Amino acid sequence: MNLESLLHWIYVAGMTIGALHFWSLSRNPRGVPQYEYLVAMFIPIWSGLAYMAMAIDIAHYARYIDWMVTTPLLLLSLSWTAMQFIKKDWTLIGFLMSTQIVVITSGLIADLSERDWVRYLWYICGVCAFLIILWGIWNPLRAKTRTQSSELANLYDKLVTYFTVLWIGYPIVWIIGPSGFGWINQTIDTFLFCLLPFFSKVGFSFLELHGLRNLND
Amino acid sequence: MNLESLLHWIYVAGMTIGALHFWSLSRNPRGVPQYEYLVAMFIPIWSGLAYMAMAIIAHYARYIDWMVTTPLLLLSLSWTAMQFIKKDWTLIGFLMSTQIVVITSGLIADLSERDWVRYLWYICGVCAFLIILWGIWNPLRAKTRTQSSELANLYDKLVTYFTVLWIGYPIVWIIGPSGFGWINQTIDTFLFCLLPFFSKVGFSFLELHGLRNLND
Ligand SMILES: *C/C=C(C)/C=C/C=C(C)/C=C/C1=C(C)CCCC1(C)C
Numbered sequence A: 001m002n003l004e005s006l007l008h009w010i011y012v013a014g015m016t017i018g019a020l021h022f023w024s025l026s027r028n029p030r031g032v033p034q035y036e037y038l039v040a041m042f043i044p045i046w047s048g049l050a051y052m053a054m055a056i057d058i059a060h061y062a063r064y065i066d067w068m069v070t071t072p073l074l075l076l077s078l079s080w081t082a083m084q085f086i087k088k089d090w091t092l093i094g095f096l097m098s099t100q101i102v103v104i105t106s107g108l109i110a111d112l113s114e115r116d117w118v119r120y121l122w123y124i125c126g127v128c129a130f131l132i133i134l135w136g137i138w139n140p141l142r143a144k145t146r147t148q149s150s151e152l153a154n155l156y157d158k159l160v161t162y163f164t165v166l167w168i169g170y171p172i173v174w175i176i177g178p179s180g181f182g183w184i185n186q187t188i189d190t191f192l193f194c195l196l197p198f199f200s201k202v203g204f205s206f207l208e209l210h211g212l213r214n215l216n217d
Numbered sequence B: 001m002n003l004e005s006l007l008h009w010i011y012v013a014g015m016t017i018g019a020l021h022f023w024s025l026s027r028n029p030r031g032v033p034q035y036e037y038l039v040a041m042f043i044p045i046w047s048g049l050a051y052m053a054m055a056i057i058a059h060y061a062r063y064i065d066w067m068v069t070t071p072l073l074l075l076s077l078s079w080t081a082m083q084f085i086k087k088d089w090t091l092i093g094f095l096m097s098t099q100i101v102v103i104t105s106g107l108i109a110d111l112s113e114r115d116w117v118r119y120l121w122y123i124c125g126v127c128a129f130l131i132i133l134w135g136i137w138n139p140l141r142a143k144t145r146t147q148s149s150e151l152a153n154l155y156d157k158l159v160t161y162f163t164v165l166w167i168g169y170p171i172v173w174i175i176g177p178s179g180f181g182w183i184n185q186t187i188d189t190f191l192f193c194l195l196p197f198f199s200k201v202g203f204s205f206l207e208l209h210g211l212r213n214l215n216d
């Protein structure tokens, strides 16, 4: 077992404990609907299985297949929270989910590219889609909370802030590592791509679910 | 000049004449707002330039064309569906983004070494495309039911035409060198010249003349 494998196995253990936690919470719901629990549970399982694949073995192909599914589901969870006590705006949800899939596919195309100028344009394409996500979660998604209580609005702000900080991390780590400028080697890059998603997948959903449970009482 | 190059140049001239026509119509608009003309003009210009580049993976620029023109085509279709009502921009964005997923999936599929990987990405693109088809036939179609039956009937003809052509793309892809290889690159190129002509000039021609005739 090499270092990358070990980091991946640790991440797999992390996902496993978070999903069990979310499962445990789902059994004593405290006013939180089951669909929120189930998505919160599915995210780390999907990511867990993708990382397990890498642990058993372009580099880290499975990382993209993880993101293909987990990142729109994370936006779904964020969107459910913003609209917790109102009608769910499904086309807004759909907008955010699909735009986020463009970010990931752009990243993958970028990483599959042999010419540097092409690689970076696809990266920029990914960043642009990501900027639309950030505009989306800070403006129209955020305005949905204004018709609801300030407890919910405050919870959202905390969640969207935590969400934003972590998500900005991905394009940065991508571009400083072997896929981009090569300022860091693959093993350190893998390490950051374990630490960052643990907080995005377990950390975020943990704050989401506990926030919603305390808000209900 | 070889055969594909000639086909791409004929396509360029096709795009050029379509773009001039729509520009000409915009000067006597008949109640059709300028933004609909401008998108109708932009589509074949973008496509023409991508094909011009090709005339001067195989056919990369074909995807870069699609990256832009297919969501713009969905923008036009949407504007038509909501011609005499408030624009549902989140519905528009959903269709536009989902359509970009179709194209990026298509490209990733075409970039894939392993066959099983190629085909899964193809399937993913087909799934996103199925969601587009559901979108244009259901929530987008429902927008027309609040408006006049003349508009509703026009949309019905337009969405049918739109749907028929768009189904051709995943077919032409899979039967050519990117898929099963039932047809060579030259014939594949020929189809990828015919189909877009009808999707870009044909559809916008029917959209614009349909809306103008509806207003009188
Ligand atoms: C659990 C995993 C998460 C939340 C991953 C998020 C990943 C991103 C926000 C990736 C963004 C990228 C760009 C904005 C530019 C292209 C490169 C990507 C895919 C790393």
Ligand SMILES: *C/C=C(C)/C=C/C=C(C)/C=C/C1=C(C)CCCC1(C)C
Pocket: B066, B069, B070, B073, B102, B103, B105, B106, B107, B109, B121, B122, B123, B125, B126, B129, B166, B167, B169, B170, B173, B196, B199, B200
């Ligand atoms: C002017 C060009 C147009 C309207 C192109 C449309 C292209 C498609 C609808 C392509 C669809 C595909 C799939 C559904 C599966 C993946 C392969 C593609 C990209 C050919």
